[PDB]
Amino acid sequence: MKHSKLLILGSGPAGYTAAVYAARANLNPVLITGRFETEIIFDHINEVDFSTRPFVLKGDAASYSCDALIISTGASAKYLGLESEEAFKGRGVSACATCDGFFYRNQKVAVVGGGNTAVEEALYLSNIAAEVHLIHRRDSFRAEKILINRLMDKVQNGNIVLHTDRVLDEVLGDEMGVTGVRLKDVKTGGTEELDVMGAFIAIGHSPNTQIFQGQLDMKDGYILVKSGLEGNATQTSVEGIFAAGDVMDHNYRQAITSAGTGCMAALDAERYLDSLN
Amino acid sequence: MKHSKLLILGSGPAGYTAAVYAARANLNPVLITGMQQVENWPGDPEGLTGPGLMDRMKEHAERFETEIIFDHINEVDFSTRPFVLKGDAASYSCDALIISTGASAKYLGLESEEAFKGRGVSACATCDGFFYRNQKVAVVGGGNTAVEEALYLSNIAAEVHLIHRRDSFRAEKILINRLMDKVQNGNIVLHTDRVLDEVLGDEMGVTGVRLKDVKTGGTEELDVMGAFIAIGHSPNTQIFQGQLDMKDGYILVKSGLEGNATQTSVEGIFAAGDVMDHNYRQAITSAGTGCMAALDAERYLDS
Report how far residue A97's alpha carbon sits from residue A104's, in angstroms, rounded to the nearest whole number: 10
B222 and B238 share one domain: no
Note whether B276 contacts A: Cβ–Cβ < 8 A. Answer: yes
SS3 B112: helix
A35 and A90 share one domain: no
Report how far residue A58's alpha carbon sits from residue A63's, in angstroms, rounded to the nearest whole number: 5
B116 and B204 share one domain: yes
A37, A236, A256: best mutation site toward chain B, by most B Cβ within 10 Å? A256
Report how far residue B101's alpha carbon sits from residue B1's, in angstroms, rounded to the nearest whole number: 22
A161 and A98 share one domain: yes
B119 and B77 share one domain: no
User: Would the annotation count B166 as a binding residue?
Assistant: yes
Domain boundary residue among A163, A183, A204?
A204
B139 and B197 share one domain: yes
A127 and A209 share one domain: no
What letter would DSSP give residue A227?
-
Residues in chain B: 303
Please name the member of B156, B295, B299 whose beta carbon is closest to the beta carbon of A26: B156
Are A169 and A183 within 8 A, CB to CB?
Answer: yes
Report how far residue A174's alpha carbon sits from residue A199's, in angstroms, rounded to the nearest whole number: 14
Are B131 and B46 within 8 A, CB to CB?
Answer: no
What letter would DSSP give residue B262?
T
For A159-169, letters b (16+ CB in 10 Å) and e give: ebbbbebbebb
Domain boundary residue among B232, B267, B282?
B232
A20 and A35 share one domain: yes
Are B62 and B68 within 8 A, CB to CB?
Answer: yes
Note which residues in 55-94 of chain B have CB less than 8 A from chain A: none
Backbone angles phi, psi at A74, to 5 degrees: 65, -170
CATH of the domain at B282: 3.50.50.60
Report how far residue A67's alpha carbon sits from residue B118's, in angstroms, rounded to the nearest whole number: 34
Report how far residue A45's alpha carbon sits from residue A61's, in angstroms, rounded to the nearest whole number: 9
Beta carbons of A24 and B291 less than 8 Å apart = no
Are A254 and A12 within 8 A, CB to CB?
Answer: no
A176 and A85 share one domain: yes
Which one, of B128, B68, B116, lies nearest residue B92 by Cα? B68
Are A261 and A244 within 8 A, CB to CB?
Answer: yes
A49 and A91 share one domain: no
SS (H, E, C) A173-195: ECCCCEEEEEEEECCCCCEEEEC
Q: How was this structure determined?
A: X-ray
The tally of domains found in chain B comes to: 2
Q: Which domain holds residue B203?
A: 106-232
What letter would DSSP give residue A218?
E
User: Would the annotation count B281 as a binding residue?
Assistant: yes
A100 is catalytic: yes
A35, A263, A275: best mutation site toward chain B, by most B Cβ within 10 Å? A263
Are A22 and A10 within 8 A, CB to CB?
Answer: no
The alpha carbon torsion through A49, A266, B277, B289 (nearest 10 deg) reads -90
A18 and A50 share one domain: yes
SS (H, E, C) B212-252: EECCCCCEEEECCCEEEECCCEEECCHHHHHHCCEECCEEC
Residues in chain A: 277
Burial of B208 (0-12, 13-18, 19+ CB in 10 A): middle
Domain boundary residue among A155, A176, A204?
A204
Beta carbons of B252 and A229 less than 8 Å apart = yes
A73 and A210 share one domain: yes
User: Would the annotation count A150 as a binding residue?
Assistant: no
SS3 B201: strand
Q: Which residues pair with A170 in a beta bridge?
A: A182
